[PDB]
A paper describes a structure:
The AMP-forming acetyl-CoA synthetase is regulated by lysine acetylation both in bacteria and eukaryotes. AMP-forming acetyl-CoA synthetases catalyse the ATP-dependent formation of acetyl-CoA from acetate and coenzyme A in two half-reactions. In the first half-reaction, acetyl-CoA synthetase activates acetate using ATP to form acetyl-AMP under the release of pyrophosphate PPi (adenylation reaction). In the second half-reaction, the thioester acetyl-CoA is generated from the mixed anhydride acetyl-AMP and CoA releasing AMP (thioesterification/thioester-formation).
Crystal structures of AcsA from [name] in the apo form and in complex with acetyl-adenosine-5′-monophosphate (acetyl-AMP) support the flexible C-terminal domain adopting different conformations. Our structural data on [name] AcsA in complex with acetyl-AMP, the product of the first half-reaction, shows that in this thioester-forming conformation, K624 (corresponds to K549 of B. subtilis AcsA and K609 of S. enterica [name]) is exposed. In this conformation, the acetylated/non-acetylated lysine (B. subtilis AcsA: K549) will be accessible for a deacetylase or an acetyltransferase to be deacetylated or acetylated. In contrast to the previous report, at least in this case product formation of the adenylation reaction alone, i.e. binding of acetyl-AMP, rather than CoA binding is sufficient to stabilize the thioester-forming conformation, which is capable of subsequent CoA binding. We show that AlphaFold2 is a powerful tool to generate initial models, however, as shown by the experimentally determined structure of acetyl-AMP bound AcsA of [name], AlphaFold2 is not able to predict all conformations with various ligands or combinations thereof adapted by AcsA. Notably, we found in the apo structure and in the acetyl-AMP-bound AcsA structure of the [name] a phosphorylated histidine residue, i.e. His476, in the C-terminal domain. This histidine is not conserved amongst other members of AMP-forming acetyl-CoA synthetases.
Numbering used by the authors:
A (entry chain A), B (entry chain A), C (entry chain A): 14 to 640
C-alpha cells in the first residue's frame, strides 16, 4: 500500500529550485523530457556545469576513452579542487560567510568563516610542505570530526598530495593495512577523539599501526583531548607546536594539477580479503560533486547544510567537504553521536544552527524512532526545507516517521543511491519530483541507469535484475590503486556497462528501487563490510581453521554479521572462546566489524576450487527465494 | 481472504421471498436470467409495480424524455403518495395494525395504528390548510424523531405542499440557508428534542434562523419537552393549542396531484459552497420506494421493520416513512441514540418490539463493536430475519461482527448502495442472492449499472473505474431546485449516462464494490458533507483568509475532517484560536460538520483560475495511489 | 514469503544417502532425470527393490491387471513379510542388534533384540495356533503400545492370519463394529494401558464390545497394568498363563503365502456412515514400505529410528513395524503422550536413545510450541540427522520451529504425503532435495502424480485442482473388505486414474502442496474422521432426529468438529443435553471423535434425494471461497 503512494512536492520549492532554473535555460519545464535531452547532450550538460567552476587552464575535450575501459574528463584542463572550495571566495563577501559550524561531542562549538579556513589550510599546507610532502605523495589521515580534519584534507588537495582518510572507528590492523597498501609517507592524527563523553585513543592505535608501516616518516598530532599520550622523539610531533612558527599571513598557492591527477584514495570492502583503494581525481570529481549538490539539495546562499556522515566515508568526502564548499554553503560539522548526551541531540543541532538541509542515514533514523515522537517535538525544526537519506534502503515506516516528525508531513526526502566507486549521487529525487516511499526515484541528468539480466537484456517494468549504468559520468573512480584488474571487472562483468553489484527494480513510471547487494558485501549500521575480509580477521587467530561470514536481517542495524567458524581439531568450543574471538576482531579490525553472532561448525560448503560457497551457508540458515 | 467468500442464504427465505414470487409469475427461477429480462422489459416491470398502488387516474406512458436529460414516469397519472400510506388502508383490517412504534430517548413509548396516523395527519393537514398552506408551497420541518414528524410529512404530502426537512443536528445558519433557498412559507418545529438524556434547543435555534428567513409567515411548535421557550406573538404558535379546535373526525381529502408534482426537497452537500435541493416527485418515487422495500427487505404482513436512520436524511424519507408504509409494515420510530442509557439500547429495542428487519449504518455498528459481544448477547434477538446496512463501506470485520452477534451466523445482510439523488436503492442483495462481505452485490431489476473510464468505455472485471447507470429509474430526482444546470451535470459528465461520483469495481460474478467518492464529498459518521461548504463556514470568520478541507480515514467515524486554514496576516496562530474556529463552525453549521483537526498554513495550492486543488492538499498529507 | 524459500540439504547427507547410491548404480546424479527414468522403467525399479528381500519362490510378472481396476504385483511369488522382519536376520550379527527400545508411560523401559522378538513372536504364534488360528482367519488386536503388540502383529503375519488393529482410543461401539464387519475370530487385548499416568480400561471396553460380537471365540489378555479385571471363564484367558507352557525354543515356521494374500485390514473413515476396511497384502506392501523407508529416511546400520504414530493407524503399521524392521533399524516404541510427565518428554526420549530419525505429526509440534523453546533446549538432540512430519499440512511457522529447535537450523524435514489406502509414502522429499516449508516436494520414484480438473485435464502450474496418481504402485490397497464397489470409485471418479480426495497445487519446479480433503473427511488432532459417521453416532441417541457434522479450523487440533443437531419436537434444547450428547459419543465411539461444538437447529439443507448438503452448512457458517 504505502510504498505505491505518490507525494507531491511542497509549496514554493519547484518554481525556486536550481534544477528548474537550469532546465528553463535550455527550454524545458518537464523533468522527463529534460532527462531525455540530457542523455543525447551529456557533454553540453557537463560543460555547462564545469564552466561554473574556476579552471587554471581550459580543457580540450569533455570526455574520452584512453584504454577502454579507462577514460578521462576535461582532458588537459588544469585545476585544483581546493581553489574552488576556498581561494576563489577570497576578496568576495563569501570570505566572511561561515564555512564550518563545528559542534563538539560535549556541546562546545566554534564557527569558521571561509577566510579562516583559507588561512588555516594554507598554514597546515606549509607544515606538510616543510616536512617534504609534494604532489603525488600519499598522506594518511586518522582523525575525529574536527575543523583540522577538514583543513588537513584541503591542504593535501592544494598541494596535489592525495589524501587517504581512515575512519576513526577502525583499529590498528585496519589502519596499518590501508597505509601499507598505498605507501603513505606521513600520518595526520589526534591525541584522541570524543564519542559519547568517552575518549577514543587514536594516538595509541596509530602507534600500534605505525610500528608496522615502514614508509611513515612523520606523524603530526592534533592536540584535541589534551591527554598525556606517548610521543616518539623524531617521528611524532604536535601540530600546534609547528603552527606556532607558521605566520597568520602564510600562503601556499594551489598546485595547478591536471584534471586527472589523484585527489584521494578511499579503501572500500569488496569481494576479496583485502580492501580496495578507490581512486578519485580532481576535475570530474569536483564537477560531479558540485552539480549533484546544487540540484539534489538545491543549495542557495542562505542555506545551512548538514550531512551527518563521517568524513571517513565517501558520503563525508563528497557531501560534507567538497560539494557543499563548492556551492559556498555554511556546513555543520559534528564530532559526536545521535544519542549523547540524549537522543534529541540531532534536533538540538538543527535548532541551534537553523539547519535548512539534513542528509542522514536510515541507521540514525531507525535508532531515534526507538525513543518516541516526543524528542524531536521538543525542538523547533521549522528551519528545515529538505531532508535526505543515504547508504541503505529506508523502509516505509521509517520514511513516514522521518517525513512526519522531522518534515511536518511536507518536506521532500531525497533518497540518494550511489557508492564509493561512483563518487557522486547517480539515482535520486530532486525537489521537482513527486516521491514514493523507499524509492530512489529517477536517474540524475546524463545518467543512463537500467535493470538487466546476466547477459545485459532489459528485464522490463516490475521485474528484478541487476542495476547497471551505460555510460561514464565525471565523478566515477578512475582506477583501483595498484590493481587495475579489479577496476576492469566493473565494466566487464556485463558487456560494455558499469555493474553496480546491486539488485534493483524499475516500476511503470521509471522509479528505481534498490533491493541490495548481489555479492559478498554486508552493510552493518551504515558501514560497508566484506564477507571475505571478516573471515580473514578470524582466520588470523590460532584457534580458527576457517570461517564463513553472512549477513542476517536486524531491525536496528539493517544487517548484522554471523560467522560460522571451523576450529582446529581439539579446541574446546566455548562461550569464553566466542568472547575471545570477538575481542580479536574488535581490537584489530574495529567494533564496526565485530560479529554479533558466532557459531562453531565442523565443516563448510566449498566449490571444487576450495572457495567458500557463502550463498549456501546463508540459504541453509535463512532459505533462498526462488528466481 | 474473507471478502472473497460466498455465504449462501439461510433456511426458508428463498422459497418464501417476495422477489421469488414475482419472478415465478414471469417464468423465472434464476436471478441472473430474470435480471436480463428486466433490462429488456423495464416498462412492464415498473407497470406491474405501479399497478399495486392506488391511482386516482391512470397513466398514459410509463416513461418519456421531456427535454433530455429531464424525463417523467407515469405521465398524466393522478396520484398521492399519502393515500397509499394511509387512506387506502381505512375500512380494512390494516387500519388497526400498528403503523409506528414510537420509542422515546428516555424509554417512554407509544404505538400508533394506521387509523390513528390517518386521523392525526388529517388534523395536522387542517391546521396547515387554515393557515393558508396549499399545493406547491414549501413547508420546512425541523423536528426530533417523534410521531408528529411523521404526521407533518404525510400532511404536507396530502396537501400537495412539498416538505423540506432539516435534520435536527443542524444549527441556525444551516437551517436558514435551506429555508431561504426554497422560500419556505411555514416552519414546523418543537420546543426541543432529547438525545442521550439532554435537551436539544430546537426552538431557540429556529428563532436565530427565522429572524433571517423573510418568507416564514408562521412557526408551529410541538410541545415535546414542555420547557419554557420564547414565543413571538403573531408568528409562533403551539400545535396542541390549534389541534384543540380541530375535531377528531376532521377530514382533508388527498389532493390528486400529477405523478410529476413535487413531493419534497432535500438539501445535500455537493461540489459547490452551497447545498443543492434534490427534488423528488410523488409517482415514480412512490413506485420505486414501494418496489425496493418489498423485494430487498422482503416485507410480509407480520413484519416489524426498523430503519435506524434519521428522517432528516434520504434513508429516513424512503425507508422509514414512505416505502414501509406503502407495504403496510409496522415501523419502529426511535428518538434517541445507540449508547443511551447504555450501549445495548438497539438490542433492547429489537427485543421489546420483536423487530424482524433492521436497516442500520456501519457507523452504528463500528460504534457498538467497541463495547464487546456481551451487550447484544444479553438480549433475545431471535425475532430478526433480515439485516441491512447503508450509507458507507462496511469493512469485513464489521460485517462478520454484524452477522455473528446480531445475525447468529445465518441472517443475510442487505448492503444497499444508493444516494439522495437516486431516491431508492439501486445496487443491493435481495434474500435470494449469495453474499460477499463488503459487496453491494448485483443491481436491482431494470438498473443497468456499469463501471467505465472517463470516456465511457467499460473497464472490464476486476478494474477500478467510475460507477454509472445507463437508463433512468422511477424514483430518481427530477431536478435540483432553482438550479437545472446542476442536474444536467449528472447526465453530461460522461456522455448519456448517470454519473454517481463514486469509484467502483465489478468482479467476475458481477458483484459491485463501492470504494468511495471521486469528488469533494466527505462522509463523517454517516453524514454527507462537502469540502467547499466546510471551507465557506470557516472563511466567514474574521480571522480566516482561506481554507481547504480534506477527509482523513478514522476508525470510528469512517472519515474525519481536517482543514488547512490560511489566517489573515498578523493573526497569532494559537490553540485558543483553533478552539474558537471550531466553535464558530459548531454554532452556525452544526456539530456534524465540525472539523476534528485544524492546521494553520501560509499558502495553499491553486489552479490558475484561483480554485483550491484539494487533491494536492490530501496527497501532500496522505500520498496519492498511482493510476 | 517464507513458503517460497528453498533450503538446501545439510553437509554430508547427499553424498552418503541411500537414494544417491541407487541412482548412481543406474547412471544418474540428478533426481529430476532419474525420476523421469523411473516413470519409463517402473518394473525394473520395483524388481530391484523386491530382490533385496527374501522370497520363498520368485515371481513371474512384476505387475498385472486382473479385472481392471483390480491388479497384482509379483504374481505367483511366495513370501512372508514376517520372514523379512525377523527370521532372515537369525544367524547373522543383526540377531543381537536392538529391534525395539520400549519406553513406558511411567519411564520404565526395556530393549528387545531381533532374536528376542523372533522368540517372542514364535511363542505367541504357537498360542494362536493352538487355539485354532490359521491362514485367512481375522485376528482383532486392541492393545496399548507395548512389545506384545508388535509381537502379536508379526505372529499373525507369520501364520498368514490377517490382523485387524483397533486403536486403543476407540470405545466399545467402534471396536464392535470393526470386529463384526470383518468377522474376527479372536481378540488380543490387555487388562489396560497407561496414558499420562492414568489407566485406560481396555479389557472393560473389550467386554462391552465382545458381548455384541458373535464370532469372537477367544480373548487373549496381556497383563500390563496388573489390575483386577473381569475374566469370563472359557472365553477370556491371560497370555502369560498360556506362554508359561510354551517353551523358549518353540518354532512356528512362516507360512509361505502368495504375494497377494491378505496381510491386514485397517478401518478408515470415508464418505459413508460406516468405516471401510482397507485391505493390504504381503508382497507389494512389503516391497513399497521397504523402499520408501530406505530412501526417504535414509536408514543406515547405526540408526535409531522413532516414528511417534500409534500402531493403531497406518503410519504405525508401515513406518513403525514393517518398513523399519525390513531395514533392520533399531526402533523406539513409546507407550505414552508428549506432555507426561512434562512437555519435554519427546526430547528426553531422543536424548536417552540417541534417536537419529524422528517422524512425527504437526499436531504434536503445534502442541509443544505452546510450551516454549526452553524445553527442547534442556536436552541433547545432536543425535538427530533427519526429521519428518506426516498426516496433515504443517504451517510455515511450525516448520520453522521444528527446523530451528529440533533441527538446529540444518536438518531436513521429510514432509510425507500419503493415506491409509496408499500403504506407503507417495509424495515426499528425500535427503537430496532442497526443501520448501509446507511442501511435500516431488513424487517418489515411479509415482506419476498430477493435478487435474474434474474431467482429468492438467490445470498447469500454480492452479488448484484434484490430486491424482496415474499408475498403481506396489503397496496400494487391493480392495475394501466386503465392498469392492467402494474400491472401484477410487479409480472411476476421474477416468483411469487414482483419485486421492485431496486438493493440491504444483508449483513451477514441480513441488506439490496439499490443501486438504475435497470430501466429508475431517482430521482432528491427526485422526481421520468421517462427517457421516459422526452424524450416525448422534442420530443413535433418542433425543436427536438428524445431524450435520462439519470441520472448523482450530489452532491446536487442526480442525475441530461442530455438529448441527435437529432434536425431536418437544425436546428442551439445553446445556445439559449438549453435555449428554457429547458423553453419548465419547462413551460409544471414543474421545477422538467427540464434537467440541454442538448447535441445535430446526432444519438442515437437503438434496431432493434427502441427503445432507454439508458444504452448504459449512458455507453458511464460514463462507465458501469462489472457484
Ligand atoms: C554512498 C554509499 O553508501 O556508499 P558505499 O558505502 O560504498 O555503499 C554502496 C552500497 O550501498 C547501498 N545503497 C546506497 N545508497 C542506497 C540507497 N539510497 N538505497 C538503497 N541502497 C543503497 C547499495 O547496496 C550500494 O551498492
Ligand atoms: C443513501 C445515502 O447514503 O445517501 P447520501 O447521503 O446522499 O450518500 C451517498 C453516497 O454514500 C456512499 N454510499 C452509500 N451507500 C453505500 C454503500 N452501501 N456502500 C458504499 N458506499 C455507499 C457513496 O459514496 C454514495 O455516493
Ligand atoms: C498417512 C495418513 O495420514 O493417512 P490417513 O489417516 O488415511 O489421512 C490421509 C489424508 O491426510 C492428509 N495428509 C496426509 N499427509 C499429508 C501431508 N504430508 N500434507 C498434507 N496433508 C496430508 C490428506 O488429506 C490425506 O488424504
Ligand atoms: Mg588460524
Ligand atoms: Mg474571513
Ligand atoms: Mg434418534
Amino acid at each position: 500500500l504505502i510504498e505505491e503512494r505518490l507525494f507531491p512536492p511542497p509549496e514554493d520549492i519547484v518554481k525556486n529550485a536550481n534544477i528548474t532554473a537550469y532546465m528553463k535555460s535550455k527550454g524545458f519545464d518537464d523533468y522527463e523530457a529534460f532527462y531525455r535531452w540530457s542523455l543525447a547532450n551529456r557533454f553540453e550538460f557537463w560543460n555547462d556545469m564545469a564552466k561554473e567552476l574556476h579552471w587554471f587552464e581550459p580543457w580540450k575535450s569533455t570526455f574520452e576513452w584512453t584504454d577502454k575501459p579507462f577514460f578521462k574528463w576535461f582532458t588537459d584542463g588544469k585545476f585544483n579542487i581546493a581553489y574552488n572550495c576556498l581561494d576563489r571566495y577570497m576578496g568576495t563577501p563569501i570570505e566572511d560567510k561561515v564555512a564550518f559550524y563545528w559542534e563538539g561531542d560535549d556541546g562546545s562549538s566554534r564557527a569558521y568563516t571561509y577566510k579562516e579556513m583559507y588561512v588555516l589550510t594554507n598554514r597546515v599546507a606549509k607544515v606538510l610542505q616543510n616536512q617534504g610532502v609534494k604532489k603525488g605523495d600519499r598522506v594518511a589521515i586518522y582523525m575525529p570530526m574536527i575543523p583540522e580534519m577538514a583543513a588537513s584534507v584541503l591542504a593535501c588537495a592544494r598541494l596535489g598530495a592525495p589524501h587517504m582518510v581512515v575512519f576513526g572507528g577502525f583499529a590498528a590492523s585496519s589502519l596499518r593495512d590501508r597505509m601499507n597498501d598505498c605507501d603513505a609517507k606521513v600520518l595526520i592524527t589526534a591525541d584522541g577523539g570524543y564519542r559519547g563523553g568517552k575518549v577514543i585513543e587514536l594516538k595509541k592505535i596509530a602507534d600500534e599501526a605505525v610500528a608496522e608501516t615502514p614508509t611513515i616518516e612523520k606523524v603530526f598530532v592534533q592536540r584535541h583531548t589534551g591527554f598525556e599520550v606517548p610521543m616518539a622523539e623524531g617521528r611524532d610531533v604536535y601540530l600546534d607546536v609547528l603552527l606556532n612558527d607558521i605566520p597568520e599571513d602564510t600562503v601556499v598557492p594551489c598546485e595547478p594539477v591536471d584534471s586527472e591527477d589523484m585527489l584521494y584514495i578511499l579503501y572500500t570492502s569488496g569481494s576479496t580479503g583485502k580492501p580496495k583503494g578507490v581512486v578519485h581525481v580532481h576535475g570530474g570529481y569536483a564537477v560531479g560533486c558540485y552539480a549533484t549538490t546544487k540540484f539534489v539539495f538545491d543549495i542557495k546562499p542562505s542555506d545551512v547544510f548538514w550531512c551527518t556522515a563521517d568524513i571517513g566515508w565517501v558520503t563525508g568526502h563528497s557531501y560534507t567537504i567538497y560539494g557543499p564548499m563548492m556551492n559556498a554553503a555554511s556546513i555543520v560539522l559534528f564530532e559526536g553521536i545521535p544519542t549523547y548526551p540524549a537522543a534529541d541531540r540531532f534536533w538540538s543541532i538543527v535548532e541551534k544552527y537553523k539547519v535548512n538541509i539534513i542528509y542522514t542515514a536510515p541507521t540514525a533514523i531507525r535508532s531515534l524512532m526507538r525513543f518516541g515522537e516526543e524528542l524531536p517535538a521538543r525542538h523547533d525544526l521549522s528551519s528545515l526545507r529538505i531532508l535526505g537519506t543515504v547508504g541503505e534502503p529506508i523502509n516505509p515506516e521509517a520514511w513516514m516517521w522521518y517525513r512526519k516528525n522531522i518534515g511536518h508531513n511536507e518536506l521532500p526526502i531525497m533518497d540518494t543511491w550511489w557508492q564509493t566507486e561512483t563518487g557522486m549521487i547517480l539515482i535520486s529525487p530532486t525537489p521537482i519530483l513527486p516521491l514514493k516511499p523507499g524509492s530512489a526515484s529517477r536517474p540524475l541528468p546524463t545518467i543512463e541507469a537500467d535493470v538487466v539480466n546476466k547477459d545485459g537484456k532489459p528485464v522490463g517494468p516490475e521485474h528484478g535484475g541487476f542495476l547497471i549504468i551505460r555510460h561514464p559520468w565525471p565523478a566515477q573512480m578512475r582506477t583501483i590503486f595498484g590493481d587495475p584488474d579489479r577496476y576492469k571487472t566493473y565494466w566487464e562483468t556485463i558487456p560494455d556497462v558499469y555493474f553496480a553489484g546491486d539488485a534493483a527494480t524499475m516500476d511503470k513510471m521509471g522509479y528505481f528501487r534498490i533491493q541490495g547487494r548481489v555479492d559478498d558485501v554486508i552493510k552493518v549500521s551504515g558501514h560497508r563490510l566484506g564477507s571475505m575480509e571478516i573471515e580473514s580477521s578470524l582466520v588470523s587467530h590460532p584457534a580458527v581453521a576457517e570461517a564463513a561470514a553472512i549477513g542476517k536481517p536486524d531491525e536496528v542495524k539493517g544487517e548484522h554479521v554471523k560467522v560460522f567458524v571451523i576450529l582446529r581439531n581439539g579446541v574446546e568450543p566455548t562461550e569464553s572462546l566466542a568472547v575471545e574471538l570477538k575481542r580479536h576482531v574488535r581490537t584489530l579490525v574495529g567494533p564496526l566489524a565485530t560479529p554479533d553472532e558466532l557459531e562453531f561448525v565442523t565443516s563448510l560448503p566449498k566449490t571444487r576450487s576450495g572457495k567458500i560457497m557463502r550463498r549456501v551457508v546463508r540459504a541453509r540458515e535463512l532459505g533462498e527465494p526462488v528466481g
